[PDB]
């Protein structure tokens, strides 16, 4: 019923489990959010995404702004109505994808100018334009617009990028607030930057706390620093963010990354891996990923994972899916993606249950032992 309310039900070490109540629904945390790139979670109907246990999905602000356009979607009734998803939606600021998929990017204090990677150039993105677009889409959790620091980054480089983003965090905060409809029904998350330098991350965390946000995201990770660095950064970074506010690790999604991140205080995750690998032929199982294309699954009558309760493992065998994917059939992409998303949602449930029960440390240990 409330606009945003985070409640921690249980803790174990730095890990915690709880819920985020929003107008459109409850979000059980640690939570994993499927990524819906072009107003659709690849190869899945919204009902199918809900069936796997997903409480929230992530929307793209860059992508959607180019096709079909923010203003267009608003006119049509908003992303929710447009895609058929009635629960909360968190939308990226667009800044990251601009710098990765845009042609001739132009950085400046006011924002970034770029060329759409497909048809001319839907061109300008600034803190306030980002917040506007996200309002037009009608997202429940809005991400402040920032400047991601590439890896590696020198201290001065990291410093100047972090400083800029904090200025942009303030601007995002103001923009968000000026739109009453948005400020009253949505939530705004700030993003900590600073690369791998704790002094920088500390500065970023303090700035952010001074401005004040509903949730704090740890940006800058999963950009090539490797699990070891990531975890090292998470170690000192997450304790810098308000404990009573959700911590969201952006773009982190290998099953072992999630488990390790939750051990360090992360509550929300998002990643294209489950959907991506699914189209690719890679299925996640409790015993490690398997590539269904491999000849040894040609006549395997067992489900993708014998402990997985998803619709695909309950109704089809590895042999059929193996065939589907090798034949290039759409159904294979559908079934694989459904399975991977279901797997990730089961992993988040197991994490949540183990934390509530004070046995997350043993679960992580057992998880890693069998998965690897």
Nearest approach, Cβ of residue 305 and Zn ion (Å) = 5
Binding flag, residue 339, Zn ion (CB under 5 A): yes
Q: Residue 116 or 282: which CB sits closer to Zn ion?
A: 282
Tokens 């197991």 belong to residue? 350
Q: Which residues pair with 228 in a beta bridge?
A: none
Least separation in angstroms between residue 85's CB and Zn ion is: 22
Nearer to Zn ion among residue 258 and residue 304 (C-beta): 304
Closer residue to Zn ion, CB minimum distance, 312 or 333: 312
- With CB under 5 A as the contact rule, which of the stretches 172-180, 187-195, 290-298, 338-346 interacts with Zn ion? 338-346
User: Please, are residues 33 and 54 in contact by the beta-carbon 8 Å criterion?
Assistant: yes
Closer residue to Zn ion (CB): 70 or 341: 341
- Least separation in angstroms between residue 56's CB and Zn ion is 21
Q: Residues 75-104: x/- map of binding to Zn ion (CB under 5 A)? A: ------------------------------
Q: How far apart are CA 372 and CA 256, in angstroms?
A: 9
Task: Please state the closest distance from residue 363 (CB atom) to Zn ion, in A.
Answer: 20
- Which residues share a beta bridge with 18? 8, 29
The answer to the question of residue 20 lying near Zn ion (CB under 5 A) is no
User: Smallest gap, in angstroms, from Cβ of residue 52 to Zn ion?
Assistant: 9
Taking contact as CB under 5 A, which single stretch among the options 62-70, 74-82, 274-282, 337-345 is the one that binds Zn ion? Answer: 337-345
Task: Pick the piece of the chain touching Zn ion (CB under 5 A) from 105-113, 180-188, 290-298, 339-347.
Answer: 339-347
Residue 26: C-alpha distances to residues 10, 12, 45, 54, 217 (Å): 17, 22, 20, 11, 19
CB atoms within 10 A of CB 24: 19
- Closest approach of Zn ion to the CB of residue 304, in Å: 5
Q: How many residues bind Zn ion (CB under 5 A)?
A: 6
Q: How many CB atoms lie within 10 A of CB 13?
A: 14
Residue number with CB closer to Zn ion (191 or 335): 335
166 binds Zn ion (CB under 5 A): no
Q: How would you classify the pairing of strands 25-29 and 15-22?
A: antiparallel
Tokens of 157: 């480089």
Smallest separation, CB 358 to Zn ion (Å): 28
CB neighbours (10 Å) of residue 144?
Answer: 29
Report d(CA 268, CA 355) in Å as an integer.
15
Chain residues 261-320 in contact with Zn ion, contact rule CB under 5 A: 304, 308, 310, 312-313
Q: Which residues contact 128 (CB under 8 A, 6 or more apart)?
A: 171, 172, 175
Nearer Cβ to Zn ion (151/286): 286
Q: Across the chain, which distance is largest between two alpha carbons, in Å?
A: 61
Residue 208 and residue 170 in contact, taking contact as beta carbons nearer than 8 Å: no
DSSP-based three-state secondary structure for 124: strand
Q: Which residues bind Zn ion (CB under 5 A)?
A: 304, 308, 310, 312-313, 339
């Amino acid at each position: 019923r409330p606009r945003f309310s985070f409640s921690i039900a249980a803790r174990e070490g730095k890990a915690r489990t709880g819920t985020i109540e929003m107008k459109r629904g409850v979000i059980r945390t640690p939570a994993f959010m499927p990524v819906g790139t072009a107003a659709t979670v690849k190869a899945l109907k919204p009902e199918t995404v809900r069936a796997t246990g997903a409480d929230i999905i992530l929307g793209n602000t860059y992508h959607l702004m180019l096709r079909p356009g923010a203003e267009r979607i608003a006119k049509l009734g908003g992303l929710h109505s447009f895609m058929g998803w009635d629960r909360p939606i968190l939308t990226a600021s667009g800044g990251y994808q601009v710098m990765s998929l845009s042609s001739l990017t132009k950085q400046s204090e006011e924002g970034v100018t770029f060329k759409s990677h497909l048809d001319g150039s839907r061109h300008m993105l600034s803190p306030e334009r980002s917040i506007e677009i996200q309002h037009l889409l009608g997202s429940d959790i809005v991400m402040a617009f920032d400047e991601c620091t590439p890896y590696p980054a020198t201290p001065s480089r990291a410093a100047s990028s972090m400083e800029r983003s904090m200025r942009w965090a303030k601007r995002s905060r103001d923009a968000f607030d000026s739109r009453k409809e948005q400020a009253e029904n949505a939530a705004l998350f700030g993003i900590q930057q600073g690369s791998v330098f704790e002094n920088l991350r500390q500065q970023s965390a303090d700035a952010l706390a001074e401005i004040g946000f509903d949730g704090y995201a740890v940006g800058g990770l999963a950009v090539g620093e490797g699990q070891d660095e990531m975890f090292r950064v998470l170690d000192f970074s997450v304790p810098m963010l308000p404990d009573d506010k959700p911590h969201y690790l952006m773009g982190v999604g290998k099953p072992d990354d999630i488990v390790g991140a939750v051990e360090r205080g992360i509550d929300m995750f998002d990643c294209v891996l489950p959907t991506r690998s699914g189209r690719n032929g890679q299925a996640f199982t409790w015993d490690g990923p398997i590539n269904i294309r491999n000849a040894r699954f040609s006549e395997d009558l067992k489900p993708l994972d014998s402990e997985c309760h998803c619709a695909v493992c309950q109704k089809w065998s590895r042999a059929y899916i193996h065939h589907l994917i090798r034949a290039g059939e759409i159904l294979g992409a559908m079934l694989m993606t459904e399975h991977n998303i279901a797997f990730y949602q089961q992993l988040m449930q197991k994490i949540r249950d183990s934390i509530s029960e004070g046995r997350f440390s043993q679960f992580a240990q057992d998880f890693r032992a069998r998965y690897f």
